[PDB]
Structure formats: structure tokens, C-alpha cells
Nucleic acid binder design. Sequence first.
DNA 1: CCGACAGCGCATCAGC
DNA 2: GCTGATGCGC
DNA 3: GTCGG
Length: 326
Amino acid sequence: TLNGGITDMLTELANFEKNVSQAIHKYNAYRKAASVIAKYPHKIKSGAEAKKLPGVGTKILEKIDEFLATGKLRKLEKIRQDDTSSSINFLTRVSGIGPSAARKFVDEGIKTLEDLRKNEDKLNHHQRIGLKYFGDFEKRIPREEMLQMQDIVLNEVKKVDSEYIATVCGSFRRGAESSGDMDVLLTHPSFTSESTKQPKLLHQVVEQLQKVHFITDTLSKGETKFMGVCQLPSKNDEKEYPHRRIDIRLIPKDQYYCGVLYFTGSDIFNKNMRAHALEKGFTINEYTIRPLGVTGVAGEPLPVDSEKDIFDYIQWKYREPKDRSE
DNA sequence: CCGACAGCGCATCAGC
DNA sequence: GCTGATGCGC
DNA sequence: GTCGG
Ligand SMILES: Cc1cn([C@H]2C[C@H](O)[C@@H](COP(=O)(O)OP(=O)(O)[C@H](Cl)P(=O)(O)O)O2)c(=O)[nH]c1=O
Ligand SMILES: [Cl-]
Ligand SMILES: [Cl-]
Ligand SMILES: [Mg+2]
Ligand code: NA
Ligand code: NA
């Protein structure tokens, strides 16, 4: 990409803040500046040029100047020399291994991919699966494969009940050419806001996708969220597709637009939009938008008939999913 | 000069 | 086993 | 680490 060196540097700094420092706001800060720079259709030539962009303040500006001048950041080279941090940075790339498990592993002398394989009895189920598919889960999903997965999922939910609705969200719905996982929003006029004629709806759908061997593994399961692993069928004589992460969310119908807003993101967009909602006197979660009182108590859920209605309350112009790629 | 920084679902662990 | 906190991931 | 107040 055009400013790929700068956004790589910021992402590496961000990974350090998340994985090692656990400095969440510094993580998001590096991450926000990385987002707006990758989006800027111009070759950044100095830190001052970048300091014109939102999210880029003094210290990211200075780090841009250092990186432009040298190809490097001393901070990053020092982190890369730190064995504990670097081991932690690697181990947190396994799905299910965060900073706590990472440094637990490192103190146990477990710090490599093959260390993990030798001590698999030390991993919980999520971590075992993350290790099993580690190479797979480093691979992104071409949009063309996302279309095939979408075809399978949307038809299968119709097979369980023809009035299920399934919307593939996340980066795919913002039009990305590749995606990290598959995010499937699901609902049914049976299910309205927690007035349940009887649940088990998500399990029914998961059952069916397991039955056709699309879902191959389970990471988490509740009444509203399933996390697991799935795989496209291969044709005879031919290399398997990589296994893929999948998240399916079952949401009440009267909450569909909040659900699809949230599940479409991006995460930075969601954080920004939700912050502006607080500034305007509302709170937005995946289910509802509510008013806030002076003392902060949330009101009752507001009517929503579209994504645009949510933008209207907080006095934003509607943004197509493709322009929410923050 | 400093405090805010989104909001949630599910799994597991520590202590009882 | 439960509560409540922590961990990890959308 | 940035931003807004
Ligand atoms: C991680 C995260 C996600 N979301 C919402 C917004 C997200 O859009 C939605 C999907 O989460 P995802 O992790 O799959 O994000 P994505 O956009 O699909 C990624 Cl670019 P990729 O999967 O293609 O690699 O969940 C949040 O609201 N807060 C969050 O902290
Ligand atoms: Cl570097
Ligand atoms: Cl709610
Ligand atoms: Mg996704
Ligand atoms: Na991970
Ligand atoms: Na996801």
C-alpha cells in the first residue's frame, strides 16, 4: 500500500501496547492513526504532513519522522531485542492466547509453536483449536471465498426455516476484498425482544451447519453467540481450503438494525460512533440505542427501522458500510 | 493541564 | 457447585 | 497517545 511502511510501524507499536503493555488506549491511539493514514490517498513525506490528520498527534508525528529518516524505530528495535516481550508477541498470535496465558507459558519455558505442540495438555479448548489451525488462521479469506461461504450459510439457515434472515457483516459487508473471519448476523420473526415462544434457535442453525460439515469446530456457544471454525468443501483431488473462523450472532428482529450496525463495524468506527452518541446524550450497543439521563441512567429503547435512523438520533450523516472502514 | 477513552458474550479461574 | 473477577474475543 | 474542554 501507499503508506504501508508507516502503517506497519504503527501496527507493530499497537500490537506491543495491546499484547505486552496492556495499554489499551495507546493501542487504540496507534490503531486510529494507522487507520487514517492507510486511507489517506497521498504519500506521507513528513510527520508534520501526517499531524494534519486526525488521530496523529505529536509523538506519532515524531515517530513518523524517525521512521522516514532511518527506515526504523529505536523503540521497535529494542522491543524486538526483548526476549520476554517478543515471545509474548508471538504467542498471542495463537487464537485464545492473550497476554496472561502468554506470560504463563513463557515462565513455563513454553515460547515457540513447537513448544505449544509438545505441551498441548496445558492449553484450554479454545487454545488447542487456535494451535491446530494456527497456519490456517494466519491466512485471510479472499472475498470470492466469502461469497461461497455466504451462499452455503444463507441457504442452510433457509433449510432449517425459510424465514430466517442471515446477513454477512464485518469487513465483507464493508466491501473488503479479503476478510479475517466470517461474521453472520441471524434473526427470525419468531424471536422478538426476549419474548421467547422458546429459544434454541441458534443451536438449531449450528446443528445443521455441523451436519453438512461446514462448521468443523466449536469455540463458544450461548443463546446469542456462536464462535467456531468452518471450511469450504474442496473438489475431488484438490487441496483443502484453509479452515476459517466464524462468528454467528442471533439477535431479536426489532433489534436488527442495531445488530447490523454493530456487526458491520469497523471496531474503530463503532468506538467513534458510540463515543459521539455519548456526546449527544445516547448509548448505542448491539441491541438498542437509548437516551441517557443527567445522572447517566439509560432510558428505554428507541424505535429503529433502519441503520440511518440510528445515525439520525446522534445527528450524523448516514455512512455506507464501505465508508465505515476505519 | 488533565480526564475520557464503547460496549458487549462467553469460558475459565480463584476462593469459598 | 456458586459468585465474582479475570481473560479473551467480537 | 490524542483530543477536547
Ligand atoms: C473487535 C471488535 C469488533 N466489533 C464489531 C465491529 C466489527 O466489524 C464486528 C466484527 O468483528 P471482527 O473482528 O470480525 O471485525 P472485521 O471488521 O470483520 C475485521 Cl476487519 P476482519 O474479521 O475482516 O479481519 O464486530 C466491535 O464492535 N468491537 C470490537 O472490539
Ligand atoms: Cl523497526
Ligand atoms: Cl440493551
Ligand atoms: Mg470479521
Ligand atoms: Na490471539
Ligand atoms: Na468476528
